[PDB]
DNA sequence: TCCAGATACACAAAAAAAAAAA
């Protein structure tokens, strides 16, 4: 059988030794003398090499002379095999590809030859046990793998790991951005605790019907649109932008939602409306989608054409994830759900921006004497929970007390954060307007 | 008759792909693996795309060691075919030019095919009747349909939602209609607290059996064709038409249900559904339908040739939706149920027109020593819940504490609004006329 | 692999009773 080799992956790094002097730093640290399979490729590799480290500037005619001088250039298939493998180079830009082509060429050829070496033992005994031929195999396989080293991937002792700890908290010393280090969510209490809305982050509201879900959302992404530079993306795949945008014009202008909705308006209410639409207008930092029924290709499509027009994104938003399809499997729910849990968690890394996806609860919640919920009220949520950077739930105790003492106030319920403390938060509902506040008083 | 392709567009393709990698990103957008015809060109763009998608470099050879290792460089023909390729191509100047060209043609032989296999399957109908081609046809083509209906779709700006819903606003403040603005209900409270039943909304009744959904339901739909002029379609998926026609009659004449029922009857009675059956027929705006077992489809049909028919709808009830049936689905009820209640929303949606779901409620209530239902009772319901947009609960006293001084007095609790207030109003019931009316008393 | 409906045993226990403390 052929021995695995490229050829040309060897002619090519030839050609590109030969071509481009500047890279020589990367292909030095990948091949050796000995991964070479041609044995006149090895000698033209060996000439390279000796000159490259002699210092002398390398081209052909300084390598035509050097081989004539071991008169090894008859050999390689002279000045012609040369000049052709020197017009045949494609580039040079994709040296370190080749080079590793041939240590993997190299390698697995080893990797057979150790296992042919192994196998030849115990067709002839020579005298060795079963333990032997055992403890001849470990030692055989160790030092086949240990010529690869994994780079940077290996352990590393206290002291460059210390030394730059110190170094990053000294830098920080200086600039502290009053604590909130990404996205401002414009509530001071949920400031302290999650440190602002982190990028390469997955966040997930999650909440009972009718608690204050998609208004926290919205508040959440109004003021990061507001604050921040970058636009907002929003997926509405519950509601149609006309809805989202009377709610946040109630929300912003201090207008009754119910008297936007049903066109009962004064003079002040006009003008609240004209200054809020003043300032969206001179914004120009929102987006909104309302097509239904998306698969996560598409989202990541959508999301990845908008960043690029706009050179960057400032905060996702996905109403909800269950609305989600993914069409290949449409025979199992769950498998559908780890699937967009896990795109969602890959696009937020990708595009190094926060993503705020929203979930429900199950009905499991009502049927326990407290209602406060817990991380295993999310539906089908093995993936939801596993790769989730941050759960916040939302409980209004009036909604199952009337005469509770915590009227017109809401809870934040932080049930998981991997790098922050966990806890709640009091704010002030008002739902007429769809807005959440500060709790101003106790 | 040789299937549509252009093999000009995929080189010129793969030759702009292969030439520059930095247009990727839109290359991917636009044309997909299984678009192209010839199967090496499919493995060879696989290959790409693998290539590609990590960001790794590619060229010729990397793309022909790819290949190689899972032996199919000879499928492809070898490296003479991938460097011709890489030869025949000038530049990528309009290389997203055949993309398009490339998605057309597999959109046109995909078209070309079905209508092919529709045929095929009507030449051996393998005891299907015609009713069942002409359904598989229909959801075929409705399929390819939804692929790609349009593509102006995706995520809009703030300035086009804002000016709409501005036009809008105006629109509603420049026409007072008494403060609603959908379909009125008849009863004074709630109509004010909810402003008429508002169309592209998805409303659901609940309660105990013998409590009054079919006859609150009704109610609504008399009220609704009394004064709309678009007519209302039923859906009578448990009785039949002749006790809904009676029940009728019994609350419009004020005359008692079992004397209508039974026949004993007076002159005044009479004469009141006299003066009722001349209404009737001077308005003729209800449309009954009594069939069992319906699914989804066949009501979305009926829907739409009555509104193809008569110009518009106005109302569309269904009592009560644990009836309708998915074939598909019998094996787990809960997603059937769930499919129900997406269907009825997506046709409120649609057709623009509100949609009443009647539904029933569990038997945990009975446990409670408090009987007033919650949103959590429902049968089956989680989509039923996390999708209506109002729902709306009947409450009697009198049938738990036979000496309540609530005595021939009935309440309506608002268990859900998204774009309203919650509460409660009370309402006179008259068993024997089979009709709810206003209270006047404290 | 989750969600939803329903019969039955067991945990006390929970309050209420209530005895009785006052
Ligand atoms: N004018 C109003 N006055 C009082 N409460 C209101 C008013 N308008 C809306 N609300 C309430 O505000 C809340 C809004 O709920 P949302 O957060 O928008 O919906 P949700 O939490 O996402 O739950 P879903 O999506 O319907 S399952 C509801 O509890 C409404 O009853
Ligand atoms: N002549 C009458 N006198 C007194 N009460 C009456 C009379 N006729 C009807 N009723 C009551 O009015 C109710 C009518 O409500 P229905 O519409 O039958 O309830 P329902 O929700 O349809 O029950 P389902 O369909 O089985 S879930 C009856 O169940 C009786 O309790
Ligand atoms: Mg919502
Ligand atoms: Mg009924």
Redesign the pocket.
């Given at each position: 059988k052929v021995p695995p080799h490229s050829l040309e992956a060897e002619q090519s790094v030839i050609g590109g030794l030969l071509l481009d002097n500047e890279r020589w730093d990367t292909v030095s640290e990948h091949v050796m003398t000995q991964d070479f399979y041609s044995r006149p490729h090895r000698l033209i590799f060996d000439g390279v090499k000796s000159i490259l480290e002699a210092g002398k500037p390398l081209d052909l005619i300084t390598l035509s002379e050097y081989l004539e001088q071991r008169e090894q250039l008859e050999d390689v298939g002279g000045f012609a095999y040369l000049a052709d493998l020197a017009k045949n180079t494609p580039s040079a830009a994709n040296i370190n590809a080749y080079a590793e082509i041939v240590a993997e060429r190299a390698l697995v050829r080893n990797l057979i030859g150790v296992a042919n070496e192994i196998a030849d033992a115990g067709y002839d005994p020579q005298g060795r046990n079963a333990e032997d031929l055992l403890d001849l195999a470990e030692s055989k396989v160790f030092a086949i793998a240990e010529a690869r080293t994994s780079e940077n991937e290996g352990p590393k002792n206290v002291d460059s790991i210390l030394e730059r700890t110190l170094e990053r908290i000294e830098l920080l010393y200086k600039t502290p951005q009053d604590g909130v280090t990404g996205v401002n969510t414009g509530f001071t209490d949920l400031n302290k605790k999650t440190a602002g809305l982190q990028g390469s982050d997955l966040i997930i509201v999650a909440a009972r019907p009718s608690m204050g879900k998609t208004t926290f959302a919205m508040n959440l992404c109004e003021n990061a649109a507001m604050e921040q530079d970058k636009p907002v993306l929003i997926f509405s795949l519950e509601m149609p932008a006309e809805q989202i945008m009377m709610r946040m014009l109630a929300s912003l202008s201090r207008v009754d939602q119910t008297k936007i909705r049903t066109g009962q308006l004064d003079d002040e209410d006009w003008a609240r409306i004209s200054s809020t639409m003043g300032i969206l207008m001179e914004k120009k930092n929102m987006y909104i989608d309302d097509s239904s029924g998306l698969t996560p290709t598409e989202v990541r499509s959508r999301a990845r054409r908008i960043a690029r027009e706009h050179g960057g994104l400032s905060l996702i938003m996905v109403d909800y994830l269950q609305l989600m399809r993914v069409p290949a499997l449409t025979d199992?729910?769950?498998?559908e759900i780890a699937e967009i849990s896990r795109s969602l968690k890959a696009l937020a890394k990708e595009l190094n921006v926060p993503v705020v996806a929203l979930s429900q609860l199950?009905?499991?919640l009502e049927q326990r004497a407290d209602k406060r919920p817990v991380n295993?009220?999310?539906?089908?949520?093995?993936s939801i929970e596993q790769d989730a950077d941050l759960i916040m739930f939302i409980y209004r105790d009036e909604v199952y007390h009337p005469d509770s003492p915590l009227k017109g106030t809401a809870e934040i319920i932080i049930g998981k954060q991997r790098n922050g403390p966990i806890g709640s938060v009091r704010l002030t509902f008002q739902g007429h307007y769809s807005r959440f506040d500060n709790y101003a008083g106790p």
């Open positions: 199992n729910r769950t498998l199950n009905r499991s295993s009220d999310l539906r089908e949520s093995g």
